[PDB]
Design a binder for these strands. Structure first.
Lengths: 98, 1033
DNA sequence: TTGAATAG
DNA sequence: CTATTCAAGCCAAGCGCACCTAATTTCC
RNA sequence: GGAAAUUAGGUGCGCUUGGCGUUUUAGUACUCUGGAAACAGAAUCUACUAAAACAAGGCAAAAUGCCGUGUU
């Protein structure tokens, strides 16, 4: 299984983070409405799934995971949140997410 | 035994479910069924009443001109007016002498068609369409150097016609022409000024809305005072007092003092305004400025604007204060203090300005006050504008509490509280059952009103049969009626012309069943400004019409959690956006990697549309930006507890009626209501099948579900008087118990009650007039018309010509024109309408054959229709008519079944045969006996029964409900089934038979019996009288 | 939806 | 009788009051 | 939940009008016959204009006259 950071949005109460958990069959999407800055700024990946999330949304696994439908480039969870922000900062500004 | 009653109140039905309180077993269930009380029925009545008045009054106008002409010997009974063209006479009379006959013909033509009087101030840019405003404007520019008759005669000579949509003019233009005509003809004929004033009077006068009809009318009134006072409402706190007029002086002073007493001032002294500051604000701001501002209040008590809170506010945000309307209107005319500071006089002026509706009646009644007003002031007061409507309180209430508004800071509700004054409550004491009359006050819609009356009668019959229930639980239907339904088939848009000419063609092509969905997507398309709300991409109207199944209506919050099926939960989006969304909220969907826009972009676009005029709803915004996890059980129970109330006005009124009734007569019945979608919500989670065209029983099923709903909400509250998953499992467990579900599914003693209609003087006959012809065999045939000859989808003329060309009258008379028509049919035979293809390819309409090609356009074609049997002969109204003139479709009142020598027969009573006497109706005995002789019903025959619409008839052992006499001559009657419509009965069998049940009462009829039901569906056989009833009250 | 005529 | 066929008055313009909804302020 | 106010919108009851629409009769145009032509006859199809009737019908009696398809 591979965990991807698919979507992020800077809020006043931390950030909103969407993670896709993908195997060969299924895509399980986790919506984290509020993960704090102390986790996002310091790439503490191993704490992410402690935080409250919505029930995972199950759908068929996609053929590729390069970019989302908004245009952000999808980053593996192991690479960290700062890689996602660094690659997608300008487009996040365009879409009111930064 | 103790029971719980559930009701499903619908547009056409009242379902009742009676189940046991302890066992939860179904005791009884059934449906009471009735016609929809659609407003179009009364609309049609009052439309036809209005059309009769116009026709009577135009005839009376013509006859009064005709009497004027007799009195001045301009007309005799020997006067010959036949060959006079009145356009030519009207034109020539404007500058030369007319003969007496020409002059009379011109005046009578002017009197008959005299124009509009009220459009005349309004003028529009021409958009080239069927509006009378636009046509009045086009004609007003065409008359800048011409009289009406001159323009009409140019149209007659150039275009060959005058009459039609083009022919709409102002009365004032006819009057101009009539004065020029009379100015010339008075030099050549012996008339006087009284002739001219009387004729011009007849030409231009009509009644006003506030005069109403002449003496003796049940719809009329004797004066403007009576008219207005019967229309106006009563005071909230003194229900025998009429409301104050809206702009009475003391009413606006009352409003101003309420506005001031609700202020809170941020300052070292008192938070609230003291008396003398209110005096100074009234006298120096409200009596000096027409529209007072916050800056002027703040300057008068020497604080700044931000030290003042509590003021009413406009939607723009600007502060709003009571305007003193009569004060400033009378002040601009007159600043004398013996007028302007007489509060009683200003109240009287405002009353007169509001009740009376014309300047001259204002002046007369203001003059009758005998005030110190000058005549020149009264003439200026009489032309003030805006004096319309009522205040919700009487002057008694206002003048009662005005002193305490001055010298306390209490507002009106606190003062009426301290005085122990309460709004009126209707007494319900000496009543053995719930009366239907308290429905009449509070309800507005006629559909809901009939449903409520039937619901009350059902409850009264249930209490009468089974005793008092412990719980009555009610659901009212929602989500449209079939009336406003048709108003979207009529209204269709705001930007009417260029778009609605093509949706009208798409909607008319489209069948009536699967076409409400498309108009709802149009409604949502217009409120979303043509944007898919999940992608913010444009939706083309044209693509929405050609490809409607490419755009889906998505529920914002899913039905699995929301149970809301209104416009506040539905949006129009692309098919792929609704597919990718799935079972999610917009927040969950747009935050994923499946979206094309971000949630923040979505939230900004929604919050900007949340503002403004015609804004999106607050509950729509709350659904769209729901951020909670709807899969969590606390959120789901929040959606259930929040949206189960049924907040609607009609429901609150019915609940107050029922709770008041049980409270007053010491009956302990708990009455509750649940919202619309909720029962379908429960069936979506109890696995009740989608196909429910299995009859009217689904209404009683829903009522049974409604009754068990009560159990779910009691056992929840004992659960909430209290290890998380186990508790969720107990809420969800008792919510889902299928024990009663199979108990309802196996129920099979549903009862049905169809409401019987016995009203006389309904529609007698169809309006359309038909001519007739005799063939060689002496048969009389009806002549029918083909019109819309050039409409694109009209294949009627093609099918007629290919099947039976000899039916066209043209075929026999004028065969050369027929040949032209046949040639077009040959040439464009593969098209649906060949004359449309001819018009499209050639630009011309089919003309009558002439050798110089100057034949008139053909626009309708007569053909020989069916043989004439049932009819009303009206030929006597048409003197020297060569053929019969008829009307058709003799609407039947009832049939009376007889048994004559072992053969069943019947007499039809037509609505035409039921004659209004003094205070009742009487079956015509001469028509009845001619019917008996026609049917060969002997005096030895036994009378079996009378059958009205929706009476139950058992024929040869099978029970039906009666529609009506289908065919008197061939002894046929139409019926329908009782538990289902025959249409649905055949569609369940996948049967293609035509969905009408016709029965022939004759020698193959073995048995006829009449049954009946009470309002709950209990069947009993009727013992009929010895004789058919003659009188109906 | 319904009066009611017609072909077979 | 069974199955079919035919067709059924309309739209534009103004006014009075009553009631309802939506938004806003105060209190009960 | 209830009271009052301001604005926008909606519904209903009732009132007042307009121009159509259906039908007959008459005139005119169109078709056919006679005729050099005015015109005459036939046909009653198609159109225009006028006048009249338009839920059957019931009142009333010079009159901005009244009632007749709704609800219970």
């Amino acid at each position: 299984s591979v965990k991807y950071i698919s979507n992020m949005s800077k809020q006043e109460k931390g950030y909103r983070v969407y993670v896709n958990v993908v195997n060969e069959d299924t895509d399980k999407g986790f919506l984290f409405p509020s993960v704090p800055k102390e986790v996002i700024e310091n790439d503490k990946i191993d704490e992410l799934f402690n935080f409250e999330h919505h029930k995972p949304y199950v759908q068929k696994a996609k053929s590729r995971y390069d970019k989302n439908g908004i245009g952000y480039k999808i980053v593996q969870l192991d690479e960290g949140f700062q890689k996602f922000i660094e690659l997608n900062k300008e487009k996040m500004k365009e879409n009111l997410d930064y | 035994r103790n029971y719980i009653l559930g009701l499903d109140i619908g547009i056409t039905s009242v379902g009742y479910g009676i189940i046991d309180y302890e066992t939860r077993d179904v005791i009884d269930a059934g449906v009471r069924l009735f016609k929809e009380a659609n407003v179009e029925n009364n609309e049609g009545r009052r439309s036809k009443r209005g059309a009769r008045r116009l026709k009577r009054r135009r005839r009376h106008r013509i006859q009064r001109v005709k009497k004027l002409l007799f009195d001045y010997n301009l007309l005799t009974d020997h006067s010959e007016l036949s060959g006079i063209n009145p356009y030519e006479a009207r034109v020539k009379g404007l500058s030369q002498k007319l003969s007496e006959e020409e002059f009379s013909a011109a005046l009578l033509h002017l009197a008959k068609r005299r124009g509009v009087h009220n459009v005349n101030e309004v003028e529009e840019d021409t958009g080239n369409e069927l509006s009378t405003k636009e046509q009045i404007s086009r004609n007003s520019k065409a008359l800048e150097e011409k009289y009406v008759a001159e323009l009409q005669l140019e149209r007659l000579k150039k275009d060959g016609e005058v009459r039609g949509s083009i022919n709409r003019f102002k009365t004032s233009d006819y009057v101009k022409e009539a004065k020029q005509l009379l100015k010339v003809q008075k030099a050549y004929h012996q008339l006087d000024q009284s002739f001219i004033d009387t004729y011009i009077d007849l030409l231009e006068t009509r009644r006003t809305y506030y005069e109403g009809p002449g003496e003796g009318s049940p719809f009329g009134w004797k004066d403007i005072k009576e008219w207005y006072e019967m229309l106006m409402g009563h005071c909230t706190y003194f229900p025998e007092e009429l409301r104050s007029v809206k702009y009475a002086y003391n009413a606006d002073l009352y409003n101003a003092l309420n506005d001031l007493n609700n202020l809170v001032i941020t300052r070292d002294e008192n938070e609230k305004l003291e008396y003398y500051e209110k005096f100074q604000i009234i006298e120096n701001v409200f009596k000096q400025k027409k529209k007072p501002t916050l800056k002027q209040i703040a300057k008068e008590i020497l604080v700044n604007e931000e030290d003042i809170k509590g003021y009413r506010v406009t939607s723009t945000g600007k502060p709003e204060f009571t305007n003193l309307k009569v004060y400033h209107d009378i002040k601009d005319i007159t600043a004398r203090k013996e007028i302007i500071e007489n509060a009683e006089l200003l109240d009287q002026i405002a009353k007169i300005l509001t009740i009376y509706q014309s300047s001259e009646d204002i002046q007369e009644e203001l003059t009758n006050l005998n005030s110190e007003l000058t005549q020149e002031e009264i003439e200026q007061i009489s032309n003030l504008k805006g004096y319309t409507g009522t205040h919700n309180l009487s002057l008694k209430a206002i003048n009662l509490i005005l002193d305490e508004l001055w010298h306390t800071n209490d507002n009106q509700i606190a003062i009426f509280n301290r005085l122990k004054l309460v709004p009126k409550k209707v007494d319900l004491s000496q009543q053995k059952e719930i009366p239907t009359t308290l429905v009449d006050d509070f309800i507005l819609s006629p559909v809901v009103k009939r449903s409520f009356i039937q619901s009350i009668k059902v409850i009264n019959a249930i209490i009468k049969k089974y005793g008092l229930p412990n719980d009555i639980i009610i659901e009212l239907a929602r989500e449209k009626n079939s009336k406003d339904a048709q108003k979207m088939i009529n209204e269709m848009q705001k930007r009417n012309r260029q778009t609605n000419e093509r949706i009208e063609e798409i909607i008319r092509t489209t069948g009536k069943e699967n076409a409400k969905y498309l108009i709802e997507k149009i409604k949502l398309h217009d409120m979303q400004e043509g944007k898919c709300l999940y992608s913010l991409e444009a939706i083309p109207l044209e693509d929405l019409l050609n490809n409607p199944f490419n755009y889906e209506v998505d529920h914002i919050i899913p039905r699995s959690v929301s149970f809301d099926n209104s416009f506040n939960n539905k949006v129009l989006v692309k098919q792929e956006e609704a597919s990718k969304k799935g079972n999610r909220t917009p927040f969950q969907y747009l935050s994923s990697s499946d979206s094309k826009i971000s949630y923040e972009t979505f939230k900004k676009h929604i919050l900007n549309l949340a503002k403004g005029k015609g804004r999106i709803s607050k509950t729509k915004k709350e659904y769209l930006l729901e951020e909670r996890d709807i899969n969590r059980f606390s959120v789901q129970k929040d959606f259930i507890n929040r949206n189960l109330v049924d907040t609607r006005y009609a429901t609150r009124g019915l609940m107050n009626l029922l709770r008041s009734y049980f409270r007053v007569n010491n009956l302990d019945v708990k009455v509750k209501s649940i919202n619309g979608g909720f029962t379908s919500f429960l069936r979506r989670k109890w696995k009740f099948k989608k196909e429910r065209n299995k009859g009217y029983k689904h209404h009683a099923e829903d009522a049974l579900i409604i009754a068990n709903a009560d159990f779910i909400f009691k056992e929840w509250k004992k659960l909430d008087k209290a290890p998380e998953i186990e508790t969720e499992q107990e809420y969800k467990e008792i919510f889902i118990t299928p024990h009663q579900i199979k108990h309802i599914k196996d129920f099979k003693d549903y009862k049905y009650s169809h409401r019987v209609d016995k009203k006389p003087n309904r529609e007698l006959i169809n309006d359309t007039l038909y001519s007739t012809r005799k063939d060689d065999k002496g048969n009389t045939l009806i002549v029918n018309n083909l019109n819309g000859l050039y409409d694109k989808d009209n294949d009627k003329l093609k099918k007629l010509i290919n099947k039976s060309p000899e039916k066209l009258l043209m075929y026999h008379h004028d065969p050369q024109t027929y040949q032209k028509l046949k040639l077009i049919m040959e040439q464009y035979g593969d098209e649906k309408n060949p004359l449309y293809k001819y018009y499209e390819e050639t630009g011309n309409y089919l003309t009558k054959y002439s050798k110089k090609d100057n034949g008139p356009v053909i626009k309708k074609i007569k053909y020989y229709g069916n043989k004439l049997n049932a009819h009303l002969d009206i030929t006597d109204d048409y003197p020297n008519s060569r053929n019969k003139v008829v009307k058709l479709s003799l609407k039947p009142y009832r049939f009376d079944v007889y048994l004559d020598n072992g053969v069943y027969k019947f007499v039809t009573v037509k609505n035409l045969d039921v004659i209004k006497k003094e205070n009742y109706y009487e079956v015509n005995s001469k028509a009845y006996e001619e019917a008996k002789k026609l049917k060969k019903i002997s005096n030895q025959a036994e009378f079996i029964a009378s059958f009205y619409n929706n009476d139950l008839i058992k024929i040869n052992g099978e029970l039906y409900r009666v529609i009506g006499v289908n065919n008197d001559l061939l002894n046929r009657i139409e019926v329908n089934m009782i538990d289902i419509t025959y249409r649905e009965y055949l569609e369940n069998m996948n049967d293609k038979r035509p969905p009408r049940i016709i029965k022939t009462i004759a020698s193959k009829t073995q048995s006829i019996k009449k049954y009946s039901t009470d309002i709950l569906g209990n069947l009993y056989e009727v013992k009929s009288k010895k004789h058919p009833q003659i009188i109906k009250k």
